[PDB]
């Protein structure tokens, strides 16, 4: 028949490390994986303006480097003889100035290249054998026409894409989209050449993310006068930076169930008090908070107060109050 | 005969005895003490840990192929197996006499073979070299500076302290108790798994193939051998995050970071420890090797801690929670004190019935060399063990001096004759030699025969089997020693130390009532015998425990609750309890503990709690306070709903479980082959033990109160998603349950790593039923889609004693004696509970240990009568021997009546006492039967064996009366005096000293006060038969 | 007499807390994964109206963002020259307007874009070179024409997909179909942008289930003018749903031993007394009983274990079962 009372609420006076809610930046030091690739604004797909049969093909093949003007193959195209004759025979009898200008511009629309029409006026002879040359410096990545073949208008005679300013694309994890959007400078490095390491300051962050992985696409261009960075090479894009200042507590200090996240605050006296908090993101051992604590509050750094493989996160916190 | 050879070698032997004396004073110094070598030892513990959480197959099997093997091992007897929540305890048992290690070396034959059939991750671990009784020194690590926490403290224990103490010799195991184990928790978001198209199984594997080192052999450069070595050990949270799960042709990977969060956190907790109700703490506990020395170790430990003051980190404090020395010393100090008080009393008794400095001296010297001789033989048994060794040397200090003083008196008056016949002014060295010899001749033989008889009446204690035998075994030896030795010294030394070197108003108080005992011999013989009938009646007042409740400063609180409580809850219930206990002014420190400690010696479940209470020294208690009164305040102050609390002493507990298994003094066990039957019998019994007026609380632990959440996988259902029964279980073992999956190798430390969904997904029978599952074919389903999940009840923890299920019933009585309670208990069971099918009932605890002592006693009294008869026939006459035995029971009659006045009970401490009471009879018969013979052997004995003149032997017996009183009264004076100290109940172990004493106390006062009239008045009636 | 009295200073030490029964709807809450995807109503697949050849291809590739009006390429289409020429011819020699229009129509259903027919009448000059532009703001996801090519009337010159009212589609497991009702409340949240608070415009439970993953398809249209929500991004869909009204108690206060399920009612006299309830469902910390209680009734939600034990021991439970 005793009447001695006691405080039920869980108690701790023999071991409780507490940190203090500071305000500062989340820092980052990451290295994203990147690849060296062809410039896509330097793209040339050569294909005959008319059908015909191939006469000869110069010693090129897929993989070879070509410069602008490099002859690719000779072909005979008969689609234009009928109209070419018309212009010629028209001069044999001195047709009108406009009569000529006409037939001569019908040939343009006909497909016959401008540089081949001039060879019609100058030689005054019908043109049947034409040569196609590479339109730009670059690497031949496709070459579907060999000797002995006919040539259709849709066949590609050459897929010539360049590396002049070669491209590099890093794969940054979506997780830090909020941070990379306002990034300022990256440091490019390529293991193939340890001296071509430079600081990238201008880059475009594509509006779509790969889904296989869940990464953003950051595309930057590097000058390649020497032709050192070869497409197909691995490269690294590094990012060392800090975020806008936010509320910072030790990652250890946050008790996150699957659905509700919060921290154990240590009050002005010595009593524990679970408070719900809003999280932003963590990095390098600290988590920033969107809201929930006041700059300078005390908080314990432990989920070590709730034996993992049991206790109801909700229930165990309740026992700490009232 | 041998005494003459002694006076021949006057000097030498004496010097030998004083050498055996200082050799004696060192045959002790291997001293400290064992409050208890009382443990049983015919049991080897085998502890298999966490094979799987299934209290029906995990410990059906570990109790199946593993115990079937322990059915095969030699020395096999019974294979009991505790079988709990992922833990398997097995206790092999043997024949009492078997050598400890012999047992282990056999048990160890089938622990090996069997090891292979265990699942991966579990090791069937053999117990330590010590037992439960070995828990010597406990302590909690604390830190109020907030510089450290539970995680750090526990790690401080496992990787520093435990290793520093386990070194110290004679220590068998430094276990950890309570605290938090740092765990690397990989929290896998089931949603990421889907989004990134990665399966749980893939994660487990990916994690495995990324946490080890590799050797690359050597490679000789500059004629030197260069060792190739590769990294790979996990040791940064980053390393975790950068575990690769898959990678594209692009060389763009997906890391463990992308589907999970790696957070440090508390591992599972087996048991919880809490200090003073103000904080959960981490603890250590030094277990002591079976045989070795308690104090020696304890002390070697303390100094090893001071060597760790500049060693511990700032803020860390070892607050010690249990210390065996405190008692061990308080027990060896009290008994030392008594051996000093009983020595002085005799020096004031041998000097109160002898007025000569050199008369008391002689009798006094009979002690130092008699104490030392005891010390000698205290090496054959070693006094390392028990108060009984010291208590037995304190119990028989009264008779040890008796042998000398009695001889001395046969010399005193033997000198009063040669001085009255011969002159007074001429005495040389020859004359004194001659009187010393005369003194040794007549009282010589008789005295020895006696001391042989006493050791014979005591012999039957050697046969006492077990803990009781060990309790009064040393005592049984250490008594047969200083006494059989003092009879050797007194026959080779004592005489030489007495040669080299108001008693009226007591003879006038005596004989007036003596001449009345002769009014009619036989009638005075009957009125004394009827005093035996008066003892039989009041046999019906006191009771009888098995052993006097010995009280240590420490006090063990063990509340029990129904079998289902959760860790979080029990840990709370603990701190609640701790705060109440602390509020009681007499307690100094409180060290709570639910669950178990990192030791094979702790099987206690979470719903059970052992809280260890130290109370401030008696010099600080309240006014009218007493232990039995504190325990009562404790039982009233500390109490929550549905929680029986049982109060038991620290030591008695571990031992009580090592002998029978029960945690309480009262113990009922109901062993049945079926399960529903035993729990049924358990509840009915539980209800009648409450009604009985002699109970403070009663609750029988349960067996089938377990709560389950079942996941009954549906083969057919799972098949649709191409998932095997195992494929699904991975979401039970790892997704839901947070099964271990690896360890980080951090220097001399090792911490666990594990996978698991965030709490929320596994919150309830609803959450579980909506567990998201990423199937092999990348289908997004839920656990319910492939299995029904029901809540159910089942085995909380299968228990067995001898391969047959059983439940212990715990009962607490303390306001009323035991024997009165126990008898009523099994008398209330059979009359109300009724007999259920196949289910045997029985008792345990102390009662079971009491029934083993009682038996053999009916062979302990006749084995003394078969050997006493042999000794009675130093007189040769048979008709004379029968008297002795009848003059003894009256002495017993006294031992009983004093139990009543003291309020004691009938123990095996008292049991021992009474046998040592008849051990005095023989001597008693020698003192007077030699005088009586003599009087009728002397010169007036040519007057009786010739004719008749009654008024002649009336002067020979009146003279035998005045001759006995002097040497006899003094011998009684020493006993009565050495009777008092043992009788006092103040001090550590003084109670037990009292129970083993009072039997002799009243016992000795009644013999002198009786067999002074009865022994003679029975001879004046047997002479009157031959004639 | 049912129930069991407990020394009030023991339950006070236990820290016994109690919650009150109440009738209302149980709100289920469950999370689901979702992909941020392009909007399929912002979908243009530019294709030339007639065949010609590429004169010039602007600095664009698949993956680049474009606005409405962005030039994609230049090309020369000869097919329309005759008609045009015939039109300009009659303009010289004044033909009836019925003749003129009757030609711009042949021009129209020939293919020639309205804007280039306007550029014709405005300059009275034959239009031969044309420029295809981006018909909407969006993202190029296909671009099969580069410099030096002839253009076929069926090559996709540009597949542009919009994403402003961006789509987010969560995947619900068929078995859990019931979780999503009309009243259901939704909340979007993307990990890539912890700083954005999304606004759902409208949500739809799609007709059939993705047989590939056995999931229903819940598609939400979501405001995204800052373009912060990139297609491909992960998105977690939190859903709330209200059930029909039921008795409501904290889940910490219900004991379920499979066979029966009970709660401990705190009487008017402070007398703890067990009662059988029939559960209906449970979610987010609260379980809904179908029957067994009455709103206003007090229900213990802490120290429940021990108190239930005490009640079991006192026979309180054995009593409860025979009385009804
Ligand atoms: Cu126990």
Short mmCIF file of C-alpha atoms in Angstrom, two decimals, chain B residues 135-340:
data_model
loop_
_atom_site.label_atom_id
_atom_site.label_comp_id
_atom_site.label_asym_id
_atom_site.label_seq_id
_atom_site.Cartn_x
_atom_site.Cartn_y
_atom_site.Cartn_z
CA UNK B 135 30.12 -14.16 -11.76
CA UNK B 136 32.57 -12.32 -9.53
CA UNK B 137 32.93 -8.66 -10.48
CA UNK B 138 30.43 -6.59 -12.45
CA UNK B 139 30.60 -2.98 -13.60
CA UNK B 140 29.03 -0.39 -15.89
CA UNK B 141 30.85 2.11 -18.08
CA UNK B 142 29.43 5.61 -17.86
CA UNK B 143 30.20 9.09 -19.16
CA UNK B 144 28.35 12.25 -18.17
CA UNK B 145 30.55 14.54 -20.25
CA UNK B 146 28.59 13.52 -23.33
CA UNK B 147 31.94 13.03 -25.01
CA UNK B 148 31.05 9.38 -25.63
CA UNK B 149 27.87 7.32 -26.07
CA UNK B 150 26.56 3.75 -25.79
CA UNK B 151 27.98 2.89 -29.21
CA UNK B 152 31.46 4.01 -28.17
CA UNK B 153 31.33 2.60 -24.64
CA UNK B 154 30.25 -0.88 -25.75
CA UNK B 155 33.08 -0.82 -28.28
CA UNK B 156 35.40 0.31 -25.49
CA UNK B 157 34.36 -2.84 -23.64
CA UNK B 158 34.58 -5.35 -26.48
CA UNK B 159 37.92 -4.20 -27.89
CA UNK B 160 39.82 -2.91 -24.87
CA UNK B 161 38.50 -3.86 -21.44
CA UNK B 162 37.45 -7.43 -22.26
CA UNK B 163 40.94 -8.07 -23.64
CA UNK B 164 42.76 -6.48 -20.70
CA UNK B 165 40.93 -8.52 -18.07
CA UNK B 166 40.66 -11.88 -19.82
CA UNK B 167 44.47 -12.02 -19.58
CA UNK B 168 44.59 -12.08 -15.78
CA UNK B 169 45.08 -15.72 -14.69
CA UNK B 170 42.25 -17.84 -13.28
CA UNK B 171 39.69 -15.77 -15.20
CA UNK B 172 37.61 -17.76 -17.69
CA UNK B 173 35.57 -15.09 -19.47
CA UNK B 174 35.03 -11.33 -19.43
CA UNK B 175 31.50 -11.09 -20.80
CA UNK B 176 29.74 -7.97 -22.05
CA UNK B 177 26.32 -6.93 -20.76
CA UNK B 178 23.98 -4.34 -22.24
CA UNK B 179 25.35 -1.62 -24.49
CA UNK B 180 25.05 -0.91 -28.21
CA UNK B 181 26.95 -2.60 -31.06
CA UNK B 182 27.81 -0.32 -33.98
CA UNK B 183 26.11 -1.65 -37.11
CA UNK B 184 26.43 -0.56 -40.73
CA UNK B 185 22.83 -0.40 -41.94
CA UNK B 186 22.12 -0.49 -45.67
CA UNK B 187 18.58 0.84 -45.95
CA UNK B 188 17.32 -0.23 -49.39
CA UNK B 189 14.46 1.80 -50.87
CA UNK B 190 12.20 -0.75 -52.59
CA UNK B 191 11.26 2.02 -55.02
CA UNK B 192 14.82 2.60 -56.21
CA UNK B 193 15.12 -1.14 -56.79
CA UNK B 194 12.25 -0.83 -59.26
CA UNK B 195 13.28 2.50 -60.77
CA UNK B 196 16.84 1.32 -61.38
CA UNK B 197 15.77 -2.21 -62.30
CA UNK B 198 17.94 -3.85 -59.66
CA UNK B 199 16.80 -6.75 -57.47
CA UNK B 200 17.36 -7.26 -53.75
CA UNK B 201 19.38 -10.40 -54.49
CA UNK B 202 21.59 -8.38 -56.83
CA UNK B 203 22.30 -5.93 -54.00
CA UNK B 204 23.21 -8.65 -51.52
CA UNK B 205 25.66 -10.13 -54.02
CA UNK B 206 27.07 -6.79 -55.17
CA UNK B 207 27.75 -5.99 -51.51
CA UNK B 208 29.43 -9.35 -50.91
CA UNK B 209 31.90 -9.25 -53.81
CA UNK B 210 33.26 -5.92 -52.54
CA UNK B 211 34.68 -6.22 -49.02
CA UNK B 212 37.95 -8.16 -48.79
CA UNK B 213 41.70 -8.12 -49.51
CA UNK B 214 43.86 -10.17 -51.87
CA UNK B 215 47.39 -11.54 -51.83
CA UNK B 216 49.44 -11.43 -55.02
CA UNK B 217 52.44 -13.43 -53.84
CA UNK B 218 55.93 -11.92 -54.03
CA UNK B 219 58.10 -10.43 -56.76
CA UNK B 220 61.87 -10.04 -56.48
CA UNK B 221 63.35 -6.61 -57.22
CA UNK B 222 66.87 -5.61 -56.16
CA UNK B 223 67.28 -9.17 -54.84
CA UNK B 224 64.62 -8.27 -52.27
CA UNK B 225 61.20 -9.91 -52.09
CA UNK B 226 58.33 -7.48 -52.66
CA UNK B 227 54.94 -8.60 -51.39
CA UNK B 228 52.05 -7.84 -53.74
CA UNK B 229 48.90 -6.82 -51.89
CA UNK B 230 45.49 -5.50 -52.94
CA UNK B 231 43.02 -3.34 -51.01
CA UNK B 232 39.29 -3.97 -50.78
CA UNK B 233 38.16 -3.62 -47.16
CA UNK B 234 35.02 -1.56 -46.57
CA UNK B 235 35.94 1.26 -44.18
CA UNK B 236 34.27 4.44 -45.45
CA UNK B 237 30.57 5.14 -45.88
CA UNK B 238 31.65 6.25 -49.34
CA UNK B 239 33.03 2.80 -50.14
CA UNK B 240 29.58 1.40 -49.38
CA UNK B 241 27.91 3.97 -51.62
CA UNK B 242 30.39 3.10 -54.37
CA UNK B 243 29.54 -0.58 -54.47
CA UNK B 244 28.72 -1.20 -58.12
CA UNK B 245 25.43 -2.94 -58.90
CA UNK B 246 25.51 -2.59 -62.69
CA UNK B 247 27.15 -0.56 -65.46
CA UNK B 248 26.32 0.45 -69.02
CA UNK B 249 28.28 -0.01 -72.24
CA UNK B 250 28.77 3.73 -71.77
CA UNK B 251 30.77 2.97 -68.65
CA UNK B 252 28.09 4.63 -66.55
CA UNK B 253 27.40 2.66 -63.36
CA UNK B 254 24.67 2.41 -60.74
CA UNK B 255 25.96 2.39 -57.18
CA UNK B 256 24.59 1.12 -53.87
CA UNK B 257 24.15 4.83 -53.21
CA UNK B 258 21.51 5.04 -55.94
CA UNK B 259 19.20 2.43 -54.41
CA UNK B 260 20.00 2.84 -50.72
CA UNK B 261 21.18 4.93 -47.79
CA UNK B 262 24.02 3.61 -45.64
CA UNK B 263 23.47 4.71 -42.05
CA UNK B 264 25.28 3.69 -38.88
CA UNK B 265 22.97 2.41 -36.17
CA UNK B 266 22.44 0.08 -33.20
CA UNK B 267 22.58 -3.62 -33.99
CA UNK B 268 19.92 -5.87 -32.50
CA UNK B 269 20.03 -6.04 -28.71
CA UNK B 270 20.14 -9.32 -26.78
CA UNK B 271 19.87 -7.86 -23.29
CA UNK B 272 19.74 -4.38 -21.79
CA UNK B 273 21.70 -2.94 -18.87
CA UNK B 274 20.74 0.15 -16.86
CA UNK B 275 22.34 2.00 -13.92
CA UNK B 276 20.63 3.63 -10.92
CA UNK B 277 17.50 4.19 -12.99
CA UNK B 278 19.24 7.16 -14.59
CA UNK B 279 20.65 5.92 -17.89
CA UNK B 280 21.17 2.87 -20.06
CA UNK B 281 24.81 1.76 -19.89
CA UNK B 282 27.39 -0.74 -21.14
CA UNK B 283 28.72 -3.42 -18.83
CA UNK B 284 31.33 -6.10 -18.30
CA UNK B 285 31.31 -9.11 -15.98
CA UNK B 286 34.31 -11.18 -14.93
CA UNK B 287 33.52 -14.90 -14.81
CA UNK B 288 35.94 -16.97 -12.71
CA UNK B 289 37.42 -20.30 -13.82
CA UNK B 290 35.65 -23.23 -12.14
CA UNK B 291 38.23 -24.12 -9.50
CA UNK B 292 40.40 -21.03 -9.03
CA UNK B 293 40.43 -18.43 -6.23
CA UNK B 294 37.76 -15.71 -6.04
CA UNK B 295 39.49 -12.95 -4.05
CA UNK B 296 42.95 -13.52 -5.52
CA UNK B 297 41.45 -12.83 -8.95
CA UNK B 298 39.25 -9.96 -7.74
CA UNK B 299 42.25 -8.15 -6.25
CA UNK B 300 44.42 -8.77 -9.31
CA UNK B 301 41.60 -7.13 -11.25
CA UNK B 302 41.25 -3.93 -9.21
CA UNK B 303 44.95 -3.12 -9.61
CA UNK B 304 44.64 -3.80 -13.33
CA UNK B 305 42.02 -1.04 -13.47
CA UNK B 306 44.21 1.58 -11.80
CA UNK B 307 46.71 0.69 -14.51
CA UNK B 308 43.93 1.97 -16.77
CA UNK B 309 43.34 5.46 -15.37
CA UNK B 310 45.70 7.29 -17.70
CA UNK B 311 44.46 4.79 -20.28
CA UNK B 312 40.73 5.55 -20.46
CA UNK B 313 39.41 8.45 -22.61
CA UNK B 314 38.29 11.66 -20.90
CA UNK B 315 34.81 11.34 -19.43
CA UNK B 316 34.81 7.56 -19.06
CA UNK B 317 34.11 6.16 -15.58
CA UNK B 318 33.93 2.60 -14.35
CA UNK B 319 31.20 2.55 -11.75
CA UNK B 320 31.47 -0.84 -10.13
CA UNK B 321 28.22 -2.74 -9.55
CA UNK B 322 29.14 -5.98 -7.76
CA UNK B 323 32.08 -7.10 -5.62
CA UNK B 324 32.53 -10.54 -4.04
CA UNK B 325 35.45 -9.39 -1.88
CA UNK B 326 33.21 -7.15 0.23
CA UNK B 327 31.37 -10.25 1.45
CA UNK B 328 34.26 -12.71 1.33
CA UNK B 329 36.16 -10.43 3.71
CA UNK B 330 33.18 -9.50 5.88
CA UNK B 331 32.78 -13.27 6.26
CA UNK B 332 36.42 -14.14 6.96
CA UNK B 333 36.71 -11.20 9.36
CA UNK B 334 33.75 -12.23 11.51
CA UNK B 335 34.93 -15.83 11.80
CA UNK B 336 38.46 -14.65 12.59
CA UNK B 337 36.95 -12.43 15.27
CA UNK B 338 35.19 -15.41 16.85
CA UNK B 339 38.32 -17.59 16.84
CA UNK B 340 39.82 -14.76 18.90
#
